[PDB]
Design a protein around this ligand. Sequence first.
Ligand code: HEC
Ligand code: HEC
Ligand SMILES: [Zn+2]
Ligand SMILES: [Zn+2]
Ligand SMILES: [Zn+2]
Ligand SMILES: [Zn+2]
Ligand SMILES: [Zn+2]
Lengths: 106, 106
Amino acid sequence: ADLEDNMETLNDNLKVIEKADNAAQVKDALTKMRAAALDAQKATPPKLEDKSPDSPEMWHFRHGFDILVGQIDDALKLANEGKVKEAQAAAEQLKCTCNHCHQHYR
Amino acid sequence: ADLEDNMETLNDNLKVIEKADNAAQVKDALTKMRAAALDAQKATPPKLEDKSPDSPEMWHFRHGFDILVGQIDDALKLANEGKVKEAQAAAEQLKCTCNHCHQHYR
Ligand code: HEC
Ligand code: HEC
Ligand SMILES: [Zn+2]
Ligand SMILES: [Zn+2]
Ligand SMILES: [Zn+2]
Ligand SMILES: [Zn+2]
Ligand SMILES: [Zn+2]
């Protein structure tokens, strides 16, 4: 999967969570988001001209996905506890993480 | 001013912008936010145990304020053009920057 595919996986599954009815649907979507975040963490932002892995902005790019994965894991803990409404609310807190990286690299 | 004061300056002036009527009110509030962001950039997050300036998470902390200042400057460009509704909307885009740093360090 490429960056576009991983982002649409994140995008579609965030919606699945919002519309979900049980913990299993939420857990399934969060698990898919988690893998897509770690896969996208291997890419580079197309508009960053310096793609060097050790550059500060590439550190920051990968770091943003570690933060996102941490928040996904927080939501998964709630989903695995059966707390559906709570997990859905935690998934909503992802969105500023998405929007922050987008503003900063797009 | 300390970190609490700078954050409440950011907090109060974001509200002033939302309720403003002309470019001058928006510009005045954004200018105050800008100075408070650069002042807060000198502090450290109270819950970060490693306060070393050269550590990655202290780099990230200061970097978040540079991003915020950049967005404030984008909003100021619109305010200085007289585009009040546009400037107010740009100020709204700050909020995920605020919430991102809060989630990550509080
Ligand atoms: C959090 C849950 C999300 C969600 C829902 C999305 N992202 Fe990202 N994203 C990043 C970059 C560099 C791009 C540009 C990619 C490119 O130019 O091809 C994107 C793009 C998107 C899209 C748009 C896809 C398109 O049709 O153009 C969407 C829908 C999307 N993302 C969803 C980088 C990042 C991150 C780096 C740290 C993080 C985190 C996210 N995105 C988070 C999310
Ligand atoms: C963007 C416009 C904002 C706004 C409106 C606020 N912040 Fe921050 N903030 C940061 C840290 C580390 C703290 C904890 C401070 C502490 O423990 O004393 C805060 C706290 C706040 C508050 C709460 C004040 C209180 O009564 O406890 C408020 C209202 C607030 N902030 C507003 C760190 C950062 C950032 C670092 C990169 C950025 C950016 C912001 N905050 C952005 C904003
Ligand atoms: Zn797409
Ligand atoms: Zn960066
Ligand atoms: Zn960051
Ligand atoms: Zn306060
Ligand atoms: Zn960090």
